[PDB]
Amino acid sequence: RRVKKNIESGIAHIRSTFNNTIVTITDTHGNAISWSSAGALGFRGSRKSTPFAAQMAAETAAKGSIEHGLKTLEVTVKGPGSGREAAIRALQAAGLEVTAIRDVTPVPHNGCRPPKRR
RNA sequence: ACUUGAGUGCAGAAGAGGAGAGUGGAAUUCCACGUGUAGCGGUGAAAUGCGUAGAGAUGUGGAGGAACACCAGUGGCGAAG
């Protein structure tokens, strides 16, 4: 309701950040399965960055990936943040065979300067 | 008059020394379309701002500018900047 498609493969980006962290449980191509993140955790502001936000974000979004039912799907980290461990153990240690671990902190080789500090 | 000073020669070595042309990627923005929903964002805590006109994220492709990570180090070069 509507589309009940179920597939095995997929790589759901778990991109922790400074403020919050969204785990978009995407497809191997692909399309987004469960676009649920730490904002689905109703705690907003300071409590929306703790490691309980990691375990809760993987709880809801992993519940969605159980809704699509794909058994084997790895995870990846993007952006230097403070929830990566709860994303790892909550993601692969949510009860699946998630065993891929990449590093997608976009370290720009050249690039524009960031804002003044701070 | 003479040769170490200083210069020429001969052979080596080295460098982000300079000027002009061309090329290459990583990253950000923006745009087009797929996928998807209700948050994204920021903070000391929030709000302004963005988002159901479909955002964030994710996939693909295109345009453009600026700076070149790793080597890289109280390393090198320059009269100094």
UniProtKB/Swiss-Prot annotation:
One of its GO terms (biological process) is translation. Gene3D superfamilies: Ribosomal protein S11 (3.30.420.80). One of its GO terms (molecular function) is structural constituent of ribosome. InterPro entries: Ribosomal_uS11 (IPR001971), Ribosomal_uS11_bac-type (IPR019981), Ribosomal_uS11_CS (IPR018102), Ribosomal_uS11_sf (IPR036967). GO terms for cellular component: cytosolic small ribosomal subunit. SUPFAM superfamilies: Translational machinery components. Part of the 30S ribosomal subunit. Interacts with proteins S7 and S18. Binds to IF-3. Interacts with VmlR. Interacts with BrxC. Located on the platform of the 30S subunit, it bridges several disparate RNA helices of the 16S rRNA. Forms part of the Shine-Dalgarno cleft in the 70S ribosome. This is Small ribosomal subunit protein uS11. It comes from Bacillus subtilis (strain 168).
